[PDB]
């Protein structure tokens, strides 16, 4: 509905830190400091569904090689989200993928879908707190065993 | 701790049953008559975890073109436990794989691991109701998605 | 977003159904006949909220003693869900909170939120297949046991 | 089968520990140093059930007040299982449905089942590590919502 950063950790930038894959990827921060980095709002995901974030106003974004226009939000393991800008849409969604499907952020998959450090360029912030649009979809799902005979079913894409 | 048929559905043979892979395959009967399929008590099985049974006198197992020694035991769909022979103990290993690990009695994979038709062969009826022995194995098992960045773990095998 | 009944379906009155209550209690129509009982989309709900319906415009609500203007979707038993209309929205409230909350619509608890036929009145079609607001709201739920020490969490209210 | 204490943190003695209800109430130790708490094994529970310890010969009992025969097993919250000991089986029972349903060691309702530190009386250490009886009963289990209309079906008791 109004996705945007919580409020105070904007504007942010993209940037990098030695708590989301050794400095080598790129994450939203609000500051230059020890651990400014950017926290999210969790979003309400329903099993066998997926979300990730393109911003409504490009011209709007944080910029580095290119606007960061797209995004997934993911725990940090820090206690909140934390903000991962993809190349695009379709990066967006295919990490997305791979999170909500059980992955981990230092899965091999997931590395190399993040933007690589060398791409912070100017390291330019958002005007402001900009909205992002929440991009809902299916998200193919497995059986998983419960106890005995008892199953949660899978759901189709 | 005691595995057997419930009671009253021993002595049985494995013949063939219209409702289990349109008559292909073996499955243990109590009798000849419309639908007198033996019925199976629910093992006790924890997410990360299969079973399968192996009879633990062979002596008292049911004959076809072999003692049937070893089987997995799987809901009918029709509201009862029904017991499935395999040639071994692998097989059998490999078939409550496949079903614990979320698959269906009509899946190809299941189907190949039953035993076909043409190995009922005299269609004897096991020494009584003997006990078999509840073989426990770990199943690996993946990480399920709940809500949100809930998921329930995975299991290591 | 636009919720409405599965294309068909309407218009729609509130009336009675042998399979719904014993024809005790409203649920929505769309014919006279043999089991001619209005079907509705399924919510996307996320463990931890609770979904009601409330109609945008009163006006083009079906009429009993009164517009039914809010109303709680669950499955009928019978391979589509059926719309339960309710007198307002607290109660609509209250029969969402207990069938999210894993109640049954056999549940006293259940029965004595539906309206009774008695109020079927006119029975009176809406006007079209209106839209209806999804009303959502966080739902107070407990921690459920899935294996050893692994629980899915508890969500506050 | 074979239900001790792991390799190592065996004899313990009940006693006291400020990580375990701010030493208010007995938990095995295997010394009287810093953190030297005894560590359990996880037993393999099933949604749907319990279990608690009875140790097999009383006569090799951890001794305070009482031999100390039964009792609970559940995460420390410290990466390990701790032991904790209550004056018979029925309040075992009360302690781990208590906790197998959903409950915590910090909640009153737990913190009233165990065993107060003025009952430690000569803190001896048992005869070794010996062998406890997994004591495994049904626990009355509620329906847990999932997704949709999704549940994780109630289990009787």
Same mark, same amino acid.
């Given at each position: 509905e109004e996705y945007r950063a919580k409020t105070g950790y904007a504007p942010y930038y993209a940037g990098v830190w030695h708590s989301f894959n050794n400095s080598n990827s790129l994450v939203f921060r609000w +500051? &230059?400091? &020890?651990?400014?980095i950017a926290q999210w709002p969790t979003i309400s995901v329903p099993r066998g569904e997926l979300a990730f974030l393109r911003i409504k106003?490009?011209?709007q974004a944080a910029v580095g090689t290119?606007?960061?226009?797209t995004m997934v939000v993911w725990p &940090? /393991?820090? /206690?909140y989200n934390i903000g991962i800008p993809t190349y695009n849409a379709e990066r967006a969604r295919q990490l997305a993928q791979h999170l909500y499907g059980? +992955? &981990?952020?230092?899965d091999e998959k997931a590395k190399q879908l993040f933007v690589p450090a060398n791409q912070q360029g100017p390291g330019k912030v958002s005007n402001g707190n900009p909205v992002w649009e929440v991009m809902r979809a299916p998200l193919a799902t497995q059986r998983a065993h419960i106890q005995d005979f008892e199953f949660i079913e899978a759901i189709p894409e």
């Open positions: +500051g &230059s400091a &020890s651990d400014q106003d490009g011209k290119q606007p960061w226009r &940090s /393991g820090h /206690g059980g +992955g &981990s952020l230092t």
